[PDB]
Recover the amino acids of this structure.
């Protein structure tokens, strides 16, 4: 008891400092950054806000609970106040409440007091200049609080932050003028709590009412604030719309646009994983392997944790349907390994041309196939076994009888033996010629050609268009 | 007004998006002004 | 990041090759 | 006024645009 | 073929070195 | 031994000599690009340092 | 895919189809894309009294698909039921496209100067002065003289300078705004 | 109240007149409740379920008359019914196979994309039971096998069920696409195995294809001559576009400059 009682005081001072000065220096600094320059944006405290939010998402967040200075909620949410020279007095009132909190119990517990608190900024009337400061002062307690998952009486409080964000959405439909430089930070912050829309709604069932609401927000941002807005909202669309049918494959067709410019960073890569599974549902394997590889290869630096391992998991799925895959056991991480353990023997069965080896993988690992969600291609891969199996043996064997190859091709009658190779040439597999009497399959090859034209002529536009973009970057980054 | 002053937010935004574009392209000239003046002073160096 | 997506979730052979001789 | 100055903000924009292509062709010839 | 080789060499050197001196000048001044 | 360029034919009892010596362009290509791998590996240090 | 109802002959299934459209189209905004060619069956049929609203929903899917001038063409063929209802934001876009195309059509006809002028639909110019009633009723001279400068025509502009109250001397410095942004003499 | 509605469901229809009469009574259902947007009080959606049954048999009648716009109309109604914002509905017997049997015709006509996106709704409903999925996918593997043989044996055993004129066009789109996926280009083969290509005994389809193919008609054999085919060189035909390639590329080089 004395140890646990005296170890309570040490923890709070760290949130009492960094959690106090995180939105004070970044938010209060963004106030001066929003008064002028305001180029672009930039508003570098918006990306610094991303660093602080992602910092809280690990440790320590804020709420909890935690029974440490719950008076931080009324601190920033009250006392604009009101015009800038009067706000300076309230800038001293934060220090006044620092002394009040340094004297008495400092209101270490709020809970049901969030009802007057969250409505106090509406009692001030008003900030009135910066809506992102009002939305952030209310959300910063509540957004990390969603990670508690208590599911009692505070879920509707998260919904109240969603209503405050809807007031941020109506103000996202009006001003401007003309030229809002704070709406990019509103795109950032709202995309977060739009994913908190996803989490809080997913506590019970699908959000479908918010699918028409997201389409209302996604379309009302057109065309003005779509920049960096439409990208995050399209992932908010694509993610759960990939979980719930339907039509998103043809919906993103008419939705594009592209939509440029890609922001922010890994956002477009993860979008190419989301739409990567989409474009993989059309089964064209050149665009699917390029969108899946570009999804993972374009994402630094992690941690955390396993969904960046999931894009790598589903990445080589289209490579399994290509007919040739390397053994990936050397790419296993300490985490991704234990997650894909069935998928290991799966791609090992894809390398081999044995049917029973692949079918036993299906019967045993079908439970993990339910966990991943990819099924339909597991039964049709038997056609990849007959095409890779015939690619194997044909190129392999000098002249193979249709009765001897019939074991690995499982039928290979005297009739279909013609089509196996012939319709493989239709798919561009093997050139083997067969004169059918008994018969026997005599595989030869003569090709000397290509390896030339498209690679070098495309490399011209590749390199040139690249260095042109690198011009568009460097030439435009010299403002300082 | 909806025609309008709320519509002028979209109208002026077009010239704001092209402002940022032209601003981005303005810097594209600005640093090549530094390179132009670089080799221009170097042209004064070959004249020197 | 931690932002965005990720926080959501013939043998060798020895014996058989030596046996091929004495098989036939 | 709003539409007025809105029609006044593309003047210097197009002037800077023709200055872009200008100085590009300028430093292209001076480069040679 | 040699043309594509010069493309890779010119793009490698210029792009890498320019982005270096670019990102460095921005992060140090800003 | 590769000193004698050509090959024989056992079926009809023929021996034919043919050669296409120069690899030189492939040597230049490979030397560039294979090392240019390590080039981008060297740029991995700087351009991924600004991130973290 | 509610557009499949249009294959049946009698129009009452079409009115019930668009009654399905105007509500749940939020998720179906992209669904009508491939079937717009089937919407053309209603848009090209004169004996169908609801072809107007058929051009409304066709203008909505074209609004989601990114088509602007096409949505303006169907806005002209959308009859009276189009201009009467404006909610959410369908307005600022179509009136931006309408005013833009209108003022550049007026500038096109102003260089002729006279004769051969292209036809001008009464509805696209109808929503000009009708939506300008917002500028007349709200008593905003800055925006009123703004659109008055856009139309490039002397009749409705003569009505703007004829609006009530004052504006005692405001035409003077308004011409200063004009001459500042003026293109040609 | 209202009706008689499902009285014709057990007897189906002797001709298309009763199908059009059911379309008339269903039109009266469309005159009152229509398809939407009545949430309810799901008691008003009870006759929507009673409509789903006759719309399922309406799709069986639509394929019975072979008319494509009919089927895809009632199939879109069944889709939007299961796609409606309220998913919970009384379970219908045809609710499962209407996805899979249409999927059977969908993939067995050689559509490799729409199979994945048809079952991409959610995997759970497809995994549980009543699986018709195994037949079409292996059938497609027997399309490039090809079959013919194993498909004709699979033409004797079909799930099926109640969908016929779909598999009729499915067979037609199989026959013509085999002649499209065979040559060009394949090498020399013998006669009696081309009798094994199209099977039957000596059908007139072998004369229709041996003409269409062309290719070659040899005695007791077939050839790919001549040769393999057309012998692309390509000589200097690509050299002109090779010139054009750097024409506009040196133009891009001057754009830097």
């Amino acid at each position: 008891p004395p140890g646990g009682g005296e170890q309570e005081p040490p923890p709070p001072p760290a949130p009492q400092d960094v959690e106090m000065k995180e939105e004070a220096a970044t938010g209060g600094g963004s106030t001066g950054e929003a008064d002028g320059k305001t180029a672009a944006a930039a508003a570098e405290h918006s990306q610094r806000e991303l660093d602080t939010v992602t910092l809280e998402d690990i440790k320590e967040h804020v709420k909890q609970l935690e029974k440490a200075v719950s008076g931080k909620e009324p601190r920033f949410v009250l006392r604009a106040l009101r015009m800038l020279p009067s706000t300076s007095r309230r800038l001293n009132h934060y220090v006044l409440y620092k002394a009040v909190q340094g004297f008495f119990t400092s209101n270490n517990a709020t809970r049901d007091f969030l009802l007057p608190f969250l409505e106090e900024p509406m009692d001030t009337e008003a900030d009135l200049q910066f809506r992102p400061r009002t939305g952030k002062a209310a959300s910063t307690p509540l957004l990390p609080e969603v990670e508690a998952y208590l599911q009692l009486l505070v879920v509707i409080f998260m919904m109240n932050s969603k209503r405050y964000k809807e007031a941020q959405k109506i103000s996202d439909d009006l001003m401007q003028k003309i030229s809002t430089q704070n709406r990019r930070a509103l795109d950032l912050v709202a995309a977060k709590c739009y994913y908190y829309h996803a989490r809080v709604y997913e506590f019970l069932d699908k959000l479908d009412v918010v699918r028409s609401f997201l389409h209302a927000r996604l379309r009302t941002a057109t065309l003005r604030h779509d920049a960096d807005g439409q990208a995050t909202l399209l992932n908010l669309l694509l993610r759960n719309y990939l979980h719930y049918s339907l039509y998103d494959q043809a919906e993103k067709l008419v939705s594009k646009s592209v939509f440029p410019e890609q922001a922010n960073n890994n956002e477009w890569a993860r979008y190419l994983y989301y739409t990567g599974r989409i474009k993989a549902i059309q089964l064209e394997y050149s665009e699917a392997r390029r969108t899946m590889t570009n999804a993972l290869r374009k994402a630094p630096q992690h941690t955390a944790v396993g969904f960046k391992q999931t894009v790598h998991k589903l990445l080589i799925v289209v490579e399994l349907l290509l007919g040739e895959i390397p053994d990936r056991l050397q790419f296993r991480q300490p985490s991704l390994k234990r997650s894909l353990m069935p998928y290991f023997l799966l791609t090992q069965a894809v390398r081999t041309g044995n049917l029973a080896k692949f079918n036993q993988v299906l019967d045993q690992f079908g439970e993990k196939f339910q966990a991943d969600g990819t099924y339909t291609l597991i039964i049709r891969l038997r056609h990849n076994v007959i095409k890779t199996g015939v690619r194997m043996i044909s190129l392999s064997y000098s002249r193979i009888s249709l009765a001897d190859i019939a074991q690995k091709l499982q039928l290979d009658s005297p009739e279909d033996a013609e089509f196996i190779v012939a319709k493989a040439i239709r798919d561009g597999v093997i050139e083997a010629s067969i004169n059918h009497e008994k018969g026997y399959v005599q595989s030869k090859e003569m090709i000397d050609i290509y390896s030339t034209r498209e690679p070098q002529l495309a490399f011209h536009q590749r390199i040139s268009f690249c260095l042109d973009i690198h011009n568009m970057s460097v030439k435009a980054m010299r403002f300082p | 007004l909806e025609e309008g002053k709320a519509g002028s937010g979209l109208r002026q935004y077009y010239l704001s998006k092209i402002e940022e574009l032209q601003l981005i392209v303005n810097d594209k000239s600005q640093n090549l002004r530094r390179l132009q003046a670089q080799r221009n002073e170097l042209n004064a160096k070959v004249r020197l | 990041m931690s932002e965005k997506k990720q926080p959501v979730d013939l043998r060798a052979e020895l014996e058989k090759h030596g046996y091929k001789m004495e098989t036939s | 006024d709003l539409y007025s100055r809105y029609k006044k903000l593309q003047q210097e924009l197009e002037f800077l645009e023709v200055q872009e292509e200008y100085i590009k062709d300028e430093q292209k010839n001076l480069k040679k | 073929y040699l043309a594509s080789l010069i493309r890779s060499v010119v793009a490698l050197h210029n792009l890498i070195n320019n982005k270096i001196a670019n990102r460095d000048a921005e992060k140090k001044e800003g | 031994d590769k000193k004698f360029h050509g090959i024989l034919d056992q079926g009809e009892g023929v021996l034919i000599i043919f050669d296409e010596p120069p690899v030189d362009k492939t040597y230049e290509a490979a030397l560039e690009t294979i090392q240019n791998m390590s080039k981008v590996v060297d740029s991995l240090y700087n351009k991924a340092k600004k991130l973290t | 895919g509610i557009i499949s109802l249009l294959d049946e002959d009698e129009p009452q299934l079409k009115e019930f189809a668009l009654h399905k459209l105007n509500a749940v189209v939020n998720d179906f905004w992209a669904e009508i894309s491939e079937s717009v060619d089937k919407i053309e069956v209603l848009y090209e049929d004169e004996g169908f009294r609801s072809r107007q609203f058929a051009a409304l929903v066709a203008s909505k899917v074209f609004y989601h698909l990114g088509a602007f001038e096409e949505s303006l063409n169907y806005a002209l063929g959308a009859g009276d039921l189009f201009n009467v209802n404006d909610n959410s934001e369908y307005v600022e876009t179509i009136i931006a496209k309408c005013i833009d195309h209108y003022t550049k059509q007026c500038v096109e006809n102003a260089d002729l100067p006279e004769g051969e002028k292209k036809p001008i639909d009464q509805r696209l110019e109808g929503i000009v002065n009708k939506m300008f009633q917002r500028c007349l009723d709200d008593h905003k001279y800055k925006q009123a003289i703004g659109i008055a400068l856009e139309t490039r025509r002397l009749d409705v502009f003569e009505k703007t300078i004829l609006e009530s109250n004052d504006v005692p001397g405001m035409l003077a410095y308004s011409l200063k705004l004009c001459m500042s942004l003026m293109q040609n003499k | 109240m209202y009706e008689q509605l499902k009285g014709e469901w057990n007897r189906k229809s002797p001709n298309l007149s009763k199908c059009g009469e059911e379309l008339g009574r269903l039109k009266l259902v469309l005159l009152e409740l229509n398809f939407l947007p009545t949430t309810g009080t799901k008691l008003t959606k009870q006759q929507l379920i009673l409509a789903r049954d006759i719309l399922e048999i309406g799709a069986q009648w639509s394929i019975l008359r072979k008319d494509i716009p009919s089927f895809e109309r009632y199939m879109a109604q069944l889709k939007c019914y299961y796609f409606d914002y309220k998913e919970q509905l009384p379970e219908s017997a045809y609710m499962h196979q209407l996805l899979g049997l249409n999927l059977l015709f969908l993939l067995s006509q050689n559509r490799v994309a729409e199979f994945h996106t048809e079952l991409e709704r959610l995997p759970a409903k497809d995994i549980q039971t009543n699986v018709y999925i195994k037949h079409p996918v292996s059938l497609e593997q027997y399309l490039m096998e090809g079959s013919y043989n194993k498909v004709f044996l699979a033409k004797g055993n079909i799930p099926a069920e109640s969908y016929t004129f779909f598999i009729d066009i499915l067979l037609d789109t199989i026959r013509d696409e085999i002649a499209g996926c065979i040559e060009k280009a394949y090498e020399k083969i013998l006669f009696t195995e081309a009798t094994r290509i199209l099977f039957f005994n000596t059908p007139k389809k072998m004369t229709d294809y041996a003409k269409k193919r062309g290719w070659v008609l040899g005695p007791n054999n077939y050839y790919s001559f001549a040769s393999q085919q057309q012998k692309p060189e390509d000589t200097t035909i690509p050299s002109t576009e090779l010139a054009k390639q750097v024409i506009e590329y040196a133009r891009q080089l001057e754009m830097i400059v």
Summary: Chains D and C do not touch (no CB pair under 8 Å).
